[PDB]
Design a protein around this ligand. Structure first.
Ligand SMILES: [Ca+2]
Ligand SMILES: [Ca+2]
Length: 688
C-alpha cells in the first residue's frame, strides 16, 4: 500500500501560507530530497514550514516516547494533547492496542541552508528500542466528505471540503507529478510546468468531488482511485460514472408448438432529439434492427404462424459500458419493447452474482466469451418470451425492437483511507450519486470516434446555484480537450487529425438559446472562431456529429450524400465477373445495407442480377479489412454472364435510410423502388 502513511504539507514560507508540495510518506521518514524537486523552482525548494496529519495505531500496548530529528522546531499533538514543543523531551504517552490516535505535527525553521527537508518521526518503546515509525503504524487522515453537522490543536490547512487539497490551490490551479514512490501535488507555476508536460487542474474548494461523482478531487489526481475508471475521468472536472446499454447480437423467432427465423441484429445506443434539437433525457436505450435479408415468403408463413398461434423469441445479448466508471455487483434491468410500449420481456441478471467486472469501453460478458442468451440452454425455469399473431406481424413490419435499460448499477469501488486501498463499498450506491452528476454537469455527446454516440459530462457552473458558482469556468473548447481528447497542434482544434469544422454542433432548446446569447455578446455569427470563449453551464446538452453523414431521429448514422458514397468507392483493387474488391472506410460501411448489381446492354436495357429487396447482402469484409462485393451469391453461384463485351456492369450502393425491409403494398419484391447510388460502372472488356 504505497499510498498509505501520514499526509504532509510543505511550505516555502514560515507561516503555513504557501503550500509547495502536498504528499504522503509511508514511514516516519517525512523527508523530501532536493533531487525529487525538479518541478519546483530552485528558489522555492526551501521549506520553512510543514504540517503532517494522520493517525497512529499500535499492535501492542505500551508506553511511548516520541522524538523527531528536529524537536527544537517541532510542535506535535497526539489527540490534541501537546507532546513536543520546541524542545526534545522524554515524556511517555500510553498507547492502547486497537485504538486510533490522531497525529498532528508542525515544523518551522527560518531560512534553512539546505533545499528540501530531512525530517524523521521516531518513537521509543519500553525496551528503549528507538526507530523511525514503521509503515504498519501510520494511516492517512480521513479525507472523505463530512456530514452537514461537520478543537483546534495547531495550524489548519484551509480545506473547506475535506478532500485534502488546500482551498487556494483548487481555486488558483494545481498539478501533480509522480516522483518514484510518490505523487507530489503542487501549485501551478506556468513557467515551469507547461514545458514539463504537466496538466493544470482547477476544482471547487467546496465540492469534495467537483464532478459530484464518488471520487474526491484529491483521490483522482493522486491515483487513489479504482484503476478501471477511465483516464479522462481522473480529471476533477470530468465525471466518472457508468453508462450501460444492451447490445443484441442475433435473434431466433419460432412458432410455439409441441421453420424458424434466425437473423443477425444490429444494435445502437440512441439519443432521441426533440421534434432538430438534442434531448434532455438521461435514460439508457438502444434500438435493434433485425436483418431483413433472405433466408420464399413472409416470416410468419415460413414459421407457419397463423391467427391463433403464438411466436417465441430468443436472442443473444451483451451489456456495454460506454461510460467512465466500472460496475461490480448489479447489472441494470432492461425492458425488451415492441413498437412504442409493448414490453415483451423483462431482462434481469442476478444481483451480486456477476461473473466479471463491466468496465468502461467494454462488454459483459467479455468479447472472448459467449454472449448471454435471454433464455439460457439449461435454464428451464426462465420465462419464455412470447408474442401473439398481431404482435408478430408488427415485428415483421418494422423489424425493430427497443431495449430500455434503467440506471441501477450497484455499489461503487471507493478508496479507503484506513488501509490505503480501493474496495467495493457496500454503503455506496451509484443511485446515490447519478442525480447529482446529472444536475451539476454539462453533457456533451460526440460521435467522431466510430459514429456511435459517446456521452461525457463536465463540471460546469450553475449561475443560479451558489455552490455550483464556486466551480472553475469551463469553455466548450476545454471540455472537448479534457473529456474527448480533442487537441490543437498549431492552435487549430482537431479530433484525431480531423478539423473541428468537420463536426456540427447541436443543442437542446434551452442550451441553444444560451449559446445564441453568448454568440451575440461576442459579436460572432459562427461558433468555431469562439469555442474558447463559449462558457458551459450545468445541465447543458450538446450533441456533436460528423457532418459527412445523415442521422435519423435517434441520431444514428443512416446515410450520406451521394458524392460521399461515390467517393468512398473510387478505390477499386480488383474487378472480375465474380465481383469487386475495394478499400472502403469503416464509417461508410456502417451506413450501407448492401448493393444492387445490374447488367446494362447496348440498347440501355437492364438485367438486375439480385433483384429482390432482401438480396442486398452481397458484401463481406475480408480478414485484411478489404470489402468484397459478391456477384455470384444471388446469380446461382455463377460468375456474371456478359453476352457482349460492350455491355456494362453497374453496381449501386444502398444506404440504411433508403433500405426497404418488406414487399410493397402491391406485393412487389423487386429492387425497383429502391433509392440507390451508382458506385461502379465498367464495360465487360474494361473488367476483363
Ligand atoms: Ca479542498
Ligand atoms: Ca474540491
Amino acid at each position: 500500500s504505497s499510498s498509505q502513511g501520514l499526509l504532509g504539507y510543505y511550505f516555502s514560507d514560515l507561516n503555513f501560507q504557501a503550500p509547495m508540495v502536498v504528499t504522503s510518506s509511508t514511514t516516519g521518514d517525512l523527508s523530501i530530497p532536493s533531487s525529487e524537486l525538479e518541478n519546483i523552482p530552485s528558489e522555492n525548494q526551501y521549506f520553512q514550514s510543514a504540517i503532517w496529519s494522520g493517525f497512529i495505531k499500535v499492535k501492542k500496548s505500551d508506553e511511548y516516547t516520541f522524538a523527531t530529528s528536529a524537536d527544537n522546531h517541532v510542535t506535535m499533538w497526539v489527540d490534541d494533547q501537546e507532546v513536543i514543543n520546541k524542545a526534545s523531551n522524554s515524556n511517555k504517552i500510553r498507547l492502547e492496542k486497537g485504538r486510533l490516535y490522531q497525529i498532528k505535527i508542525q515544523y518551522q525553521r527560518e531560512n534553512p541552508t539546505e533545499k528540501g527537508l530531512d525530517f524523521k518521526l521516531y518513537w521509543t518503546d519500553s525496551q528503549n528500542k528507538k526507530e523511525v515509525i514503521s509503515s504498519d503504524n501510520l494511516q492517512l487522515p480521513e479525507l472523505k466528505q463530512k456530514s452537514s453537522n461537520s478543537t483546534s490543536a495547531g495550524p489548519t490547512v484551509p480545506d473547506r471540503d475535506n478532500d485534502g487539497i488546500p482551498d487556494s490551490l483548487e481555486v488558483e490551479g494545481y498539478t501533480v507529478d509522480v516522483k518514484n514512490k510518490r505523487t507530489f501535488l503542487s501549485p501551478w507555476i506556468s513557467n515551469i510546468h507547461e514545458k514539463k508536460g504537466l496538466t493544470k487542474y482547477k476544482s471547487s474548494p467546496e465540492k469534495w468531488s467537483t464532478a459530484s461523482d464518488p471520487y474526491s478531487d484529491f483521490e483522482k489526481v493522486t491515483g487513489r482511485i479504482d484503476k478501471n475508471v477511465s483516464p479522462e475521468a481522473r480529471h476533477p472536472l470530468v465525471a466518472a460514472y457508468p453508462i450501460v446499454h444492451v447490445d443484441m447480437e442475433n435473434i431466433i423467432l419460432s412458432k410455439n408448438e409441441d421453420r424458424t427465423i434466425s437473423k443477425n441484429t444490429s444494435t445502437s445506443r440512441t439519443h432521441t432529439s426533440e421534434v432538430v434539437s438534442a434531448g434532455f433525457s438521461n435514460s439508457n436505450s438502444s434500438t435493434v434492427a433485425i436483418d431483413h435479408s433472405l433466408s420464399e415468403r413472409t416470416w410468419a408463413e415460413t414459421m407457419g404462424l397463423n391467427t391463433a398461434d403464438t411466436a417465441r423469441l430468443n436472442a443473444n445479448i451483451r451489456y456495454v459500458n460506454t461510460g467512465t466508471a466500472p460496475i461490480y455487483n448489479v447489472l441494470p434491468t432492461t425492458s425488451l419493447v415492441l413498437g412504442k410500449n409493448q414490453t415483451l420481456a423483462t431482462i434481469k441478471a442476478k444481483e451480486n452474482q456477476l461473473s466479471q467486472i463491466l468496465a468502461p469501453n467494454n462488454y459483459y460478458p467479455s468479447k472472448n466469451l459467449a454472449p448471454i442468451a435471454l433464455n439460457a440452454q439449461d435454464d428451464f425455469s426462465s420465462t419464455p418470451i412470447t408474442m401473439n399473431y398481431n404482435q408478430f406481424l408488427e415485428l415483421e413490419k418494422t423489424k425493430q425492437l427497443r431495449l430500455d435499460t434503467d440506471q441501477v448499477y450497484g455499489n461503487i469501488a471507493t478508496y479507503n483511507f484506513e488501509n490505503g486501498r480501493v474496495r467495493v463499498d457496500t454503503g455506496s450506491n451509484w443511485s446515490e450519486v447519478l442525480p447529482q452528476i446529472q444536475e451539476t454537469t454539462a453533457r456533451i455527446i460526440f460521435n467522431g470516434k466510430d459514429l456511435n454516440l459517446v456521452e461525457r459530462r463536465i463540471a460546469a457552473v450553475n449561475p443560479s446555484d451558489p455552490l455550483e458558482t464556486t466551480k472553475p469556468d469551463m469553455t466548450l473548447k476545454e471540455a472537448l480537450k479534457i473529456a474527448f481528447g480533442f487537441n490543437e497542434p498549431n492552435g487549430n482544434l482537431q479530433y484525431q487529425g480531423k478539423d473541428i469544422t468537420e463536426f456540427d454542433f447541436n443543442f437542446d432548446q434551452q442550451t441553444l438559446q444560451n449559446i445564441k446569447n453568448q454568440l451575440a455578446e461576442l459579436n460572432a455569427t459562427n461558433i468555431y472562431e469562439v469555442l474558447d470563449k463559449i462558457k458551459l453551464n450545468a445541465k447543458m446538452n450538446i450533441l456533436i456529429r460528423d457532418k459527412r453523414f445523415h442521422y435519423d431521429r435517434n441520431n444514428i448514422a443512416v446515410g450520406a450524400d451521394e458524392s460521399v458514397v461515390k467517393e468512398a468507392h473510387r478505390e477499386v483493387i480488383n474487378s472480375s465477373t465474380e465481383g469487386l474488391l475495394l478499400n472502403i472506410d469503416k464509417d461508410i460501411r456502417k451506413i450501407l445495407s448492401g448493393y444492387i448489381v445490374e447488367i446494362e446492354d447496348t440498347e440501355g436495357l437492364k438485367e438486375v442480377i439480385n433483384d429482390r429487396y432482401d438480396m442486398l447482402n452481397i458484401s463481406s469484409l475480408r480478414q485484411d479489412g478489404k470489402t468484397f462485393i459478391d456477384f455470384k451469391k444471388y446469380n446461382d453461384k455463377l460468375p456474371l454472364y456478359i453476352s457482349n463485351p460492350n455491355y456494362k456492369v453497374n453496381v449501386y450502393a444502398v444506404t440504411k435510410e433508403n433500405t426497404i425491409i418488406n414487399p410493397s403494398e402491391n406485393g412487389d419484391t423487386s429492387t425497383n423502388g429502391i433509392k440507390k447510388i451508382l458506385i461502379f460502372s465498367k464495360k465487360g472488356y474494361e473488367i476483363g
